[PDB]
Specification:
It comes from Homo sapiens (Human). Belongs to the villin/gelsolin family. This is Scinderin. This protein is of the alpha/beta class and 296 residues long. It has 3 domains: 99 residues, Severin; 94 residues, Severin (3-Layer(aba) Sandwich); 102 residues, Severin. A 7-stranded mixed beta sheet has the order 3-7-9-8-10-11-12, with helices on one face. Strands 2-1-4-5-6 form a 5-stranded mixed beta sheet, covered by helices on one side. A 5-stranded mixed beta sheet has the order 14-13-15-16-17, covered by helices on one side. β8 and β9 form a beta hairpin. The longest helix has 17 residues. The two termini are 40 Å apart. 34% of the residues are buried. The structure holds calcium ion (3 copies). The site of one calcium ion has 7 residues, from loops. The site of one calcium ion (CA) has 6 residues, from loops.
Length: 296
């Protein structure tokens, strides 16, 4: 089964480097063409940071692509971090990378793929559950292994290191030398919790969308891997972290949405913390891979 990847720029398709398959820029859209002897699948990968101008061109270009194949192709719109399982398979055992001093977050959950995501170069970008690669300007750096991190995540870390041509030293959470903190611009408190720090998978995080835009108040679960963009800016979100239940309130939620979210989390039963948008604590933010604090 043939795989072809085009980067969209600036009003058309430019072929992405064959070696760079799986390496995507966050501010860009990509057209991934999968051809099997029977039909076709077009994955339109849209970066969480791509401008709406690119989002339109990407959609226009997959239509152009589909029409040139006969209109026979299945078209699947993929948001950054919401890739259907069949896609992540087209990246043959190499992990997905999503892009002078740089910090990458490495995460694998409940199979899927190892996902590598570039994050802000702050200490509070850190996360006890995942592995991190800190690339320094001198082409060296640190692989920081969180306390609840998997071996697969360490392998992902080691992979980015080689893509970045970076000479890494391996350090463990709690055993950081003092230059590690200096390179992140000081030691702060990062994303961490009793359950984050344990690699346990027994009670995985579950996210629900609570809304009343349909008249009745309905709580529905977010399917698959969830990310930041799954947080409905105009509704209320329930995150059952097992040890804790978060109620995330969007800037545009009803007052009824808010107050019935409480009634329902108290039916869903352990602390129950209410969280304002843009005011999310590191303990909540940690359950997401990357967390672009500066979207909205
Ligand atoms: Ca761009
Ligand atoms: Ca992890
Ligand atoms: Ca609403």
């Amino acid at each position: 089964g043939k795989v072809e990847i085009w980067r969209v720029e600036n009003n058309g398709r430019i072929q992405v480097d064959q070696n760079s398959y799986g390496e995507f820029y966050g501010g860009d859209c990509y057209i991934i063409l999968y051809t099997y002897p029977r039909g076709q699948i077009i994955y339109t990968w849209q970066g969480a940071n791509a401008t709406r101008d690119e989002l339109t061109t990407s959609a226009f270009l997959t239509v152009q692509l589909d029409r040139s194949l006969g209109g026979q192709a299945v078209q699947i719109r993929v948001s950054q971090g919401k890739e259907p399982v069949h896609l992540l398979s087209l990246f043959k055992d190499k992990p997905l990378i999503i892009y002078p001093t740089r910090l990458f977050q490495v995460r694998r959950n409940l199979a899927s793929i190892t996902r590598i995501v570039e994050v802000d170069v702050d200490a509070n970008s850190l996360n006890s559950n995942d592995v991190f690669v800190l690339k320094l300007p001198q082409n060296s750096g640190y692989i920081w292994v969180g306390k609840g991190a998997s071996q697969e995540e360490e392998k992902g870390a080691e992979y980015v290191a080689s893509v970045l041509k970076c000479k890494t030293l391996r350090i463990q959470e709690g055993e950081e030398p003092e230059e590690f903190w200096n390179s992140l611009g000081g030691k702060k408190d990062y994303q961490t919790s009793p359950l984050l720090e344990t690699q346990a998978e027994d009670h995985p995080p579950r996210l629900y969308g609570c809304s009343n835009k349909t008249g009745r108040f309905v709580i529905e679960e977010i399917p698959g891997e969830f990310t930041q963009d799954d947080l409905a800016e105009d509704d209320v979100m329930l995150l059952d972290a097992w040890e804790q239940i978060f109620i995330w309130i969007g800037k545009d939620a009803n007052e009824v949405e808010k107050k019935e979210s409480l009634k329902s989390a108290k039916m869903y039963l352990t602390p129950i913390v209410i969280i304002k948008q843009g005011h999310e604590p590191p303990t909540f933010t940690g359950w997401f891979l990357g967390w672009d604090s500066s979207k909205w």
